[PDB]
Ligand binder design. Sequence first.
Ligand SMILES: COc1cc(F)cc([C@@H](CO)NC(=O)[C@@H](C)N2Cc3ccc(-c4nc(NC5CCOCC5)ncc4Cl)cc3C2=O)c1
Length: 347
Amino acid sequence: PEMVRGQVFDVGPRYTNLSYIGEGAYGMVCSAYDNVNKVRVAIKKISPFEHQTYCQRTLREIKILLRFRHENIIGINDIIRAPTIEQMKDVYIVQDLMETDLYKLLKTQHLSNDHICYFLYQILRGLKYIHSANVLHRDLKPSNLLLNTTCDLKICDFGLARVADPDHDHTGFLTEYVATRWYRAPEIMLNSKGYTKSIDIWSVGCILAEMLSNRPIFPGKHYLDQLNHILGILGSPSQEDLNCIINLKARNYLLSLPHKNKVPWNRLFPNADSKALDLLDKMLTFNPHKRIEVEQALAHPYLEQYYDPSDEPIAEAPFKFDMELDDLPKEKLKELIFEETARFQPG
Ligand SMILES: COc1cc(F)cc([C@@H](CO)NC(=O)[C@@H](C)N2Cc3ccc(-c4nc(NC5CCOCC5)ncc4Cl)cc3C2=O)c1
């Protein structure tokens, strides 16, 4: 078998001529030549089976991505693994190969207002589909936005996704949370489990702000610093918004802070299109109940050159997990991953 930077990559005979792309906690990613479709593809080698959290992420992504079909959402083309549960130590996920991601692009390139517009449109168009399936992505950030050489955009990494559950969103103050800090809505630190669609709108808001300046808008250095940064720009929440926070720890924390005025978007973003800043304000609303929804955001003046609801498709039906996954041992989750990848086996 081919080796890449001291790792077996058992993807043959279909996939050859591998090149390293990258690596992270998830595993390792290569490009490979696909000898059936005669195209280079992305292959990621995941080795999740010793970690319940890794098995959860692998299973959620696979189930979601094999169900969903949308231009602004990465597909799974193929999955390679051993013929038996006993012999299966790795899962290789084959996906369309993209040139870059928005994280890398923002560190190296100024985006024209027209690029910002088009990128935001594609993000919201993909998100409309995801929300229409009653799914929350829950980890939207530049590195989860893949781009090709013509700036077509695809959302990736559905391993933190969940079905929306607005009736069970309430929790206590500073309750611990997994998703990426600079893109976390204020309510996560105050009273929310991140089980409503407004969590994703907040993250998109953060992405938009970052496209305008090439710098994250709320770069908290650590957990409660994240809310400091948010309140530093939004200012003190209104009495009405504060009254929506019924938990006393969270309420009284907010009341203890000195009055801060709103920093106006046109001072933070002096070169930005005014319509972009109006949409930005609506996405970065403190109160998640008042926060714009994905379909309204698509209908916003800033996106008028692109808006076409007949060309912004929705999912055929809501997505459901057959069983609750968070209370399943890694051994059961491995069984479910085996089952879920069975359709790619010869036979
Ligand atoms: C601890 O964490 C874990 C544990 C797990 F058990 C499973 C996961 C899974 C599910 O949650 N998560 C991921 O796999 C995330 C983290 N990533 C990594 C990754 C690398 C490359 C590409 C990619 N990249 C390209 N092209 C690149 C772009 C940049 O520039 C260079 C070319 N094209 C096509 C593709 Cl799918 C996509 C992804 C992706 O989804 C995570």
